[PDB]
Design a protein around this motif. Sequence first.
Motif, short mmCIF file in Angstrom:
data_model
loop_
_atom_site.label_atom_id
_atom_site.label_comp_id
_atom_site.label_asym_id
_atom_site.label_seq_id
_atom_site.Cartn_x
_atom_site.Cartn_y
_atom_site.Cartn_z
N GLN A 165 1.18 -6.37 -11.61
CA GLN A 165 0.51 -7.04 -10.51
C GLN A 165 -0.35 -6.03 -9.75
O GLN A 165 -1.50 -6.30 -9.43
N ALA A 166 0.27 -4.89 -9.42
CA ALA A 166 -0.40 -3.84 -8.66
C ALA A 166 -1.48 -3.14 -9.51
O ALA A 166 -2.53 -2.76 -8.99
N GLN A 167 -1.17 -2.90 -10.80
CA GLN A 167 -2.17 -2.34 -11.70
C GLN A 167 -3.45 -3.16 -11.66
O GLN A 167 -4.56 -2.60 -11.64
N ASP A 168 -3.31 -4.51 -11.72
CA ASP A 168 -4.43 -5.41 -11.71
C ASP A 168 -5.25 -5.37 -10.42
O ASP A 168 -6.46 -5.34 -10.43
N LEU A 169 -4.56 -5.29 -9.28
CA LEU A 169 -5.23 -5.15 -8.00
C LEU A 169 -6.05 -3.85 -8.00
O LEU A 169 -7.22 -3.85 -7.65
N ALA A 170 -5.38 -2.73 -8.34
CA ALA A 170 -6.07 -1.45 -8.37
C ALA A 170 -7.29 -1.49 -9.30
O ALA A 170 -8.36 -0.97 -8.94
N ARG A 171 -7.13 -2.06 -10.50
CA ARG A 171 -8.23 -2.17 -11.45
C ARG A 171 -9.42 -2.88 -10.81
O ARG A 171 -10.56 -2.45 -10.96
N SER A 172 -9.14 -3.90 -10.00
CA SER A 172 -10.19 -4.70 -9.42
C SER A 172 -10.96 -3.89 -8.40
O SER A 172 -12.11 -4.18 -8.12
N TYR A 173 -10.29 -2.87 -7.81
CA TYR A 173 -10.93 -2.01 -6.85
C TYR A 173 -11.51 -0.76 -7.51
O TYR A 173 -12.16 0.02 -6.81
N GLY A 174 -11.26 -0.56 -8.82
CA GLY A 174 -11.72 0.63 -9.50
C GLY A 174 -10.98 1.90 -9.09
O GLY A 174 -11.55 2.98 -9.09
N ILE A 175 -9.67 1.77 -8.83
CA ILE A 175 -8.86 2.90 -8.39
C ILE A 175 -7.56 2.93 -9.19
O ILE A 175 -7.11 1.92 -9.77
N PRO A 176 -6.85 4.07 -9.15
CA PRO A 176 -5.53 4.15 -9.79
C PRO A 176 -4.45 3.49 -8.93
O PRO A 176 -4.57 3.44 -7.72
N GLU A 227 -10.38 -4.16 3.34
CA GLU A 227 -11.49 -4.67 4.14
C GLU A 227 -11.67 -3.86 5.42
O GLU A 227 -12.82 -3.55 5.79
N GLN A 228 -10.58 -3.46 6.06
CA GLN A 228 -10.67 -2.63 7.25
C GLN A 228 -11.26 -1.26 6.92
O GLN A 228 -12.11 -0.76 7.65
N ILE A 266 -11.47 11.64 -4.20
CA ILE A 266 -12.50 12.12 -3.28
C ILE A 266 -13.49 12.99 -4.04
O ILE A 266 -14.72 12.87 -3.85
N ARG A 267 -12.99 13.82 -4.97
CA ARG A 267 -13.85 14.71 -5.75
C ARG A 267 -14.75 13.95 -6.70
O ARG A 267 -15.75 14.52 -7.19
N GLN A 268 -14.46 12.67 -6.96
CA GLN A 268 -15.29 11.87 -7.83
C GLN A 268 -16.41 11.18 -7.04
O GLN A 268 -17.30 10.61 -7.68
N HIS A 269 -16.37 11.17 -5.71
CA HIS A 269 -17.30 10.39 -4.90
C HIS A 269 -18.71 10.98 -4.95
O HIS A 269 -18.84 12.20 -5.02
N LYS A 317 -15.67 2.64 7.51
CA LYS A 317 -16.52 3.60 6.82
C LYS A 317 -17.94 3.05 6.66
O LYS A 317 -18.83 3.74 6.15
N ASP A 318 -18.10 1.77 6.94
CA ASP A 318 -19.34 1.06 6.66
C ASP A 318 -19.83 1.34 5.25
O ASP A 318 -20.96 1.76 5.02
N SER A 319 -18.93 1.16 4.27
CA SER A 319 -19.18 1.48 2.89
C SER A 319 -18.31 0.62 1.98
O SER A 319 -17.14 0.38 2.29
N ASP A 320 -18.83 0.28 0.79
CA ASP A 320 -17.98 -0.36 -0.21
C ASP A 320 -17.61 0.62 -1.33
O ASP A 320 -16.96 0.20 -2.28
N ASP A 321 -17.86 1.92 -1.13
CA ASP A 321 -17.53 2.94 -2.14
C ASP A 321 -16.74 4.04 -1.43
O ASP A 321 -17.31 5.06 -1.02
#
Length: 166
Positions: free
Chosen positions: A129-140, A98-99, A163-166, A104-108
């Motif tokens: 547990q951590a895999q699931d959190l990351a999945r929810s954020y769309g990150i590894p 959230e910070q 970063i190269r995927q952004h 960044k004033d961005s959700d991506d």
Amino acid sequence: MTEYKLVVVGAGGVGKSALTIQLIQNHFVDEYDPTIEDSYRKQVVIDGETCLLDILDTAGQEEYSAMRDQYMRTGEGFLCVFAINNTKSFEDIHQYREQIKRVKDSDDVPMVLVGNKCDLAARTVESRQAQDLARSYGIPYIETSAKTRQGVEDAFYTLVREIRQH
Ligand SMILES: Nc1nc2c(ncn2[C@@H]2O[C@H](COP(=O)(O)OP(=O)(O)O)[C@@H](O)[C@H]2O)c(=O)[nH]1
Ligand code: BEF
Ligand SMILES: [Mg+2]
């Protein structure tokens, strides 16, 4: 020569500095010295591209966190670190995300979830547990040990690849 601006965030004591120093300086910091705001720069070849990594190692201790938000604002990608033996540090990831969104004033925003201290056996956060959190954020999610080097290069270079995927 491309520059990548990486920022390492997470609760106090999870191993942000140890990770960064293992990557950049090839040794393990055994002692605990709380960070205010430190920067590291190194020229490295990542996937055949010569680039300049600028890594900001931030404060996780609230008492040392003055101006952390203004430092964080510059970043292009974030290593969100918790320790696998520190359940509260994992729970804190939500407020770090959230910070990040706010600075960044961005959700991506490019991010990688890092579960550090994987050499230790006092695990209280299970991988899934951590895999699931990351999945929810769309990150590894990647586990690391600053002590053994497990995952360390992978974690930082994966953030460059996000970063190269952004
Ligand atoms: N066993 C082990 N200890 C670690 C690891 N990473 C950090 N530590 C220890 O955890 C403490 C806090 O690390 P530090 O990098 O200063 O935490 P920071 O506040 O997140 O920057 C130090 O005593 C480090 O030696 C790790 O992967 N394994
Ligand atoms: F550098 Be740590 F967040 F105390
Ligand atoms: Mg530190």
